[PDB]
Design an enzyme around this catalytic site. Structure first.
Site, mmCIF file in Angstrom:
data_model
loop_
_atom_site.group_PDB
_atom_site.id
_atom_site.type_symbol
_atom_site.label_atom_id
_atom_site.label_comp_id
_atom_site.label_asym_id
_atom_site.label_seq_id
_atom_site.Cartn_x
_atom_site.Cartn_y
_atom_site.Cartn_z
ATOM 1 N N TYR A 212 23.303 15.464 62.235
ATOM 2 C CA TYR A 212 23.817 16.399 63.455
ATOM 3 C C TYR A 212 23.546 17.705 63.042
ATOM 4 O O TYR A 212 22.991 18.474 63.660
ATOM 5 C CB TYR A 212 25.322 16.181 63.865
ATOM 6 N N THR B 123 36.117 14.911 76.280
ATOM 7 C CA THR B 123 35.300 13.938 77.113
ATOM 8 C C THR B 123 35.789 12.407 77.107
ATOM 9 O O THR B 123 36.216 12.186 76.048
ATOM 10 C CB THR B 123 33.734 14.230 76.848
#
Ligand SMILES: NC(=O)c1ccc[n+]([C@@H]2O[C@H](COP(=O)([O-])OP(=O)(O)OC[C@H]3O[C@@H](n4cnc5c(N)ncnc54)[C@H](OP(=O)(O)O)[C@@H]3O)[C@@H](O)[C@H]2O)c1
Ligand SMILES: NC(=O)c1ccc[n+]([C@@H]2O[C@H](COP(=O)([O-])OP(=O)(O)OC[C@H]3O[C@@H](n4cnc5c(N)ncnc54)[C@H](OP(=O)(O)O)[C@@H]3O)[C@@H](O)[C@H]2O)c1
Ligand SMILES: NC(=O)c1ccc[n+]([C@@H]2O[C@H](COP(=O)([O-])OP(=O)(O)OC[C@H]3O[C@@H](n4cnc5c(N)ncnc54)[C@H](OP(=O)(O)O)[C@@H]3O)[C@@H](O)[C@H]2O)c1
Ligand SMILES: [Cl-]
Ligand SMILES: [Cl-]
Ligand SMILES: [Cl-]
Ligand SMILES: [Mg+2]
Ligand SMILES: [Mg+2]
Lengths: 250, 251, 252, 250
Positions: free
Chosen positions: B155, B192
């Protein structure tokens, strides 16, 4: 609208960037006090934006520590609790580090650094723990990110503001103060003062300086300050917001 | 008055989480929006939750699918007219140190997080330059594009790549008078249902040694900065990094 | 021969020309044993001999994007000189294309070397050097193009920003786990190398004062010396950091 | 031998980081003048490193501008033209921005900022155009890169040093002065400065702060300064050298 209920102090708010910030702040529903050093200029500037129910001029020199407490009291008397402090007042010295006299160094830093310190410290004291969504916006320049061979003292002041603001942001966040602190870093912006320096806009618009091939306008900095003053940015603190035409990207 | 009047936006990975909120606020500010995602039932429900097909549509598209990118632009243009705004938001995560990352994990993540952003940025410049649209490309590049994380190696690689590649694009567009801006947005931890489904994740990122505000953000925190970047308000901002992270990177 | 890298054993990818060659040269001068890699066996064998005999330096033909070859390269190096202590992920290539103009073929080719190669060497370097008391050090070659953008090097920019931040992740994991491996990145500005020489006009463009304030570009030894510092135990508290040697390029 | 022929001034060179810089500079062949306010400490420190043929102490407060000229004159008289200036003297104040008294702010900045300005300006003036491979090394900190909630004035001073040094580097480079200017950013280092803030080493040793799990030692900063003072770094100017145990990588 976007700044409903906000009450803002904008130092150096009678000309250029500060004036546009005050203009858009009023457009978005905030009440604004703009400061400056000359009353004949400052009052016509305020009236150019709105009436004394939305914006007022207060003569203040940002390096005047005692005056800061007086400036807050006057603003609260006019409009209620201060929610937003834009530390925008500053001066420039066109000298290398080598060529800076000690008098130039001390005078510039007393406005650009001590003044920002005074406004940030007091803003934290007067706005913390009051549910205000308080925001301190420190103007810290592309000269807080890169050096310029002929702005030595200015570079030092803007680098100080840049990191001092992160200290303030962290302390407010860790202590649940409901105060945010961020820095704005304008690139070259067209102002009447830049106009009065022959060649300045032409120099700064070279592609090797500003990749867009032109300098910005004061409203370019107003709109990012609107975002930072509004609760839209309630998760942004300790960060640097760069509006510079690509200047620092190369 | 609407801050995105006349804009036409593609938001990749716009059916959940941060992308969904960007799409929502874009529509709210007067833009027409196409959101993408891989799953059609989730995607169709997401679009209708924001508005009718007159302002928002779902297109099934994997951002790593290079050929699909041209069809995605064509579909958006036929629905709403020329695209003005591209938000390269689609992205995946791998919870692995560099040492522990498999080559398949590495390639899969970079094909979405890096190749996909490349495909959308390249095509966006091609299709939006020189049309007076006030075009804006917004690349989602994370706090993990600014700092390392010991267990997010691939990432980190993808997001550092997006960060600097976006500056290349911004500079070329500016020097060539293309009327296209390119900036990166760097969210800190954001709540989220993806985070909610991972036990203890929000708790770990809310530690003061991670996020000084002591809580994580919400999707609308990222939506509002993207509205600023898509609007003509930011016509002098290009090649810059916009960090919304609760103080994460300031310490 | 002196001794700032006494006992160190270094792999220098792309060590047969330019920056990599100078790194290998100064490493040997400071007491390290070195394996240099490259894709051309003729240039590579001559490069190694130009620095020393096979008791201090050897060439291994290896494409840095060749994953399986990385394991054989470590084995070959340890067979020659003992356990590897130092990995310099230096092999890299350029493509003069804007993001707009970059083909997908060019994108994947550059990234397979500049990014995947650095990943393969960093990942394997951690696995093979951790927990061995080696004072191990991984030096990943980024660039000023990992810090600022270049309108005509889109893919290269992407690869060097990836190297910059991935290296931080690796440094953090190695530090938190007490692996005794450090990871840092070096960011050269323009350096006179074959990579620069054979891009027509490149040195002239980069020598302008609006680009490099020093008014000239660097030379390979400029990067070798910061690498010697990073490979030595002098830098034992330095990890996850960016070392910029660029004539002032990124200071303005 | 790496500093053969160099003549270095190291401010605050009698304890801690500055002492180790002086020590390693002498080991590598430089002649060194160390400064500090306290002659008891300074005379012993110089003697602990070498004889007056290689190292001398000069009592000087870095915030004393007039004394800077005397200090360069004294160094020239002993060793020849100065080639290397290490602006290392500095102090700390454990206060948030909110809690910083204006006296504390002014005192810290007069040493940490004015002193680095005085030594940089004078270093350029005295070393430009002499072909000395001159090098000015300004001691910033990780606290010039990130904020700390309880070191507000210090943050200000170290961010100023960081960006002022870039201005100086650029001017020296563009004018072909043969003077380089760089900043060093140590993370936590075991020194009297740290040893006197009770609990500071324990705090900075937490993995959440320093990923290596321990703080550094003065020799860690000495070695990067040797690199920066030597001609090995002849292409390095305007840059930030971070030796911090991973502190700023996370
Ligand atoms: N690590 C951190 O520090 C951290 C923490 C929180 C948030 N964030 C930030 O959050 C940002 C966005 O992520 P998020 O949290 O909103 O993710 P999320 O909640 O998982 O949403 C993912 C969206 O992308 C879609 N998607 C997944 N793969 C795709 C592909 N290959 N092509 C197209 N669409 C795809 C998803 O589902 P479908 O494919 O089914 O549509 C969904 O619509 C990142 O920049 C990150 O920095 C970071
Ligand atoms: N020169 C500069 O101005 C500059 C500036 C900043 C950063 N850098 C970086 O520094 C590194 C070295 O650059 P340079 O200028 O020294 O390059 P160079 O002069 O072209 O030398 C490159 C070396 O890498 C080898 N190489 C190329 N592709 C390879 C592959 N796939 N696998 C293994 N070896 C390979 C070459 O040998 P073969 O061709 O025989 O394989 C040669 O030994 C690169 O990462 C570059 O991005 C350079
Ligand atoms: N220690 C750390 O963790 C750390 C980390 C990053 C950066 N730094 C920086 O490194 C530098 C050295 O710090 P340190 O930890 O070595 O401090 P230290 O151990 O307290 O050493 C201070 C040295 O500076 C001298 N000094 C203090 N005030 C002075 C003044 N006004 N004029 C001249 N000399 C003065 C002291 O001598 P007298 O008391 O006799 O004057 C002593 O020689 C400072 O700039 C500091 O900010 C330190
Ligand atoms: Cl400013
Ligand atoms: Cl090969
Ligand atoms: Cl002198
Ligand atoms: Mg620049
Ligand atoms: Mg951090």
């Amino acid at each position: 609208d976007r700044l409903k209920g906000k009450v803002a102090i904008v130092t150096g708010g009678t000309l250029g960037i500060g004036l546009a910030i005050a203009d858009k702040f009023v457009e978005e529903g905030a009440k604004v006090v703009i400061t400056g050093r000359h009353a004949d200029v400052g009052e016509k500037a305020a009236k150019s934006i709105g009436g004394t129910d939305v914006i007022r001029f207060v003569q203040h020199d940002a390096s005047d520590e005692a005056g800061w407490t007086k400036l807050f009291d006057t603003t609260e008397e006019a409009f209620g609790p201060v929610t937003t402090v834009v530390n925008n007042a500053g001066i420039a010295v066109s000298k290398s580090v080598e060529d800076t006299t000690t008098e130039e160094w001390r005078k510039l830093l007393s406005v650009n650094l001590d003044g920002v310190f005074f406004g940030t410290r007091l803003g934290i004291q007067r706005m913390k723990n009051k549910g205000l969504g308080a925001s301190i916006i420190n103007m810290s320049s592309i000269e807080g990110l890169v050096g310029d061979p002929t702005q030595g003292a200015y570079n030092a002041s803007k680098g100080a503001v840049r990191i001092m603001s992160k200290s303030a942001a962290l302390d407010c966040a860790l202590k649940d103060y409901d105060v945010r602190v961020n820095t704005v870093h304008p690139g070259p912006i067209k102002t009447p003062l830049v106009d009065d320096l022959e060649g300045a806009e032409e120099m700064m618009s070279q592609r090797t300086k500003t990749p867009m091939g032109h300098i910005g306008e004061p409203n370019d900095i107003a709109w990012i300050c609107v975002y930072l003053a509004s609760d839209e940015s309630k998760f942004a603190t300790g960060a640097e917001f760069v509006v510079d035409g690509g200047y620092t990207a190369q």
